[PDB]
Amino acid sequence: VFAX
């Protein structure tokens, strides 16, 4: 995932 990308988170941020």
Side-chain angles (χ1 to χ4, degrees):
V1 310
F2 176 86

